Subunit: 109 residues, 4 copies
């Protein structure tokens, strides 16, 4: 698992479950090509987005649909979504509040 | 001043100075059109991006060039940039302060919205 | 103004107003002695806690009463309070801004230190 | 495992390893009694601090020695340590930078 995303809910103190996200890879013409996607599990984790062979050097974007998540809970959010854009084992963690988010990368051997 | 951005450096415990950022607005055809740009001052703040007349309802994107900031300090950061995308003014004019806190492998953003 | 504290509310996207906090200084006998206290204003800021003369070298603790803040809004938060403990002025006088961002189950604190 | 702590390093993008912390429980005379302690593993996690039987309702303090961690890396930190004080399955996560820290609780069934 070369890429995993973990999402947490700072309002309810829980994993953020059923959070949808898409992963994009930047193409030569500088547009974003869909690469992978999924929803966080009950543990707020999304695994198996890609494989080692497939996960080559490049600029990747993770677009997390935080807006739909807050809407399903009945809470008005500030952001349309949360993006994480980086040059590429990776774990991306995102901590969500209605008017704030934080994201960190844990890059290991 | 309906839109202000403040950027802080969590490694040095200082304002993040001379951080470039570009603001875009989503056009009718769903493309990002350039709206405004600037660099943070010695206090880590960027004022005067726009005016109340210009800052109409819409979806806005603030793209903060955190990578060049970290690189100029000898650090290779994780993120290409930090984005903030939000719908603005859809219930009438508001004032928005976007605050970003930067580390090489992490960032956080919060918004303060006032009437 | 050598010590200022700014508190923001991540749920409402607003300054956190009327947040009480107490500042303590570590005494010679290793106990926390009361140093100063106050409440945040309508802009989420607390100024005038101390002066340059009073604010000598030492270890300081700022205890922010986040629990009462959340409770007054009908939320049962996780944390009793948010603390910031730091050595101040040991290389000469500095100015400290302590920023806290609050959610019911989370908080973040950062310091901006200037000469 | 009713209580676990996870610590991450926002400067190096890694788990924070060998971070020492003590856990205290507030006593009737309102002082802090030592309760448990340990160091984070290579995954930045600290497990087995307590048991279900032992982990009763009360006010707990987790005092994380972030200062020694930054010092061992050669970086001057702002904080003496990072405290997490709460009324009590709990996971406390802390994300560390030299002049900043964030902490969140994930409270599950
Ligand atoms: O749960 C997390 C991080 C939660 C968290 C903490 C602080 C934050 O500010 C934030 O936004 C999120 O870390 C998981 C990463 C990980 C996974 C496997 C092995 C090693 C490391
Ligand atoms: O300096 C700030 C916020 C800095 C900060 C704090 C915590 C963070 O996690 C972060 O990323 C940034 O406050 C400015 C916002 C403001 C605007 C108008 C009125 C009141 C407050």
């Amino acid at each position: 698992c070369p890429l995993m995303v973990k999402v947490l809910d700072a309002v309810r103190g829980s994993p953020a479950i059923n959070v949808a996200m898409h992963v994009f890879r930047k193409a030569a013409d500088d547009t974003w090509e869909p690469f992978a996607s999924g929803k966080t599990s009950e543990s707020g984790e999304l695994h198996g987005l890609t494989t080692e062979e497939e996960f080559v050097e490049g600029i990747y974007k993770v677009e997390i649909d935080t807006k739909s998540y807050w809407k399903a809970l009945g809470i008005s959010p500030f952001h349309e979504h949360a993006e994480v854009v980086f040059t590429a084992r990776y774990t991306i963690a995102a901590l969500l509040s209605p008017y704030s988010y934080s994201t960190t990368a844990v890059v290991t051997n």
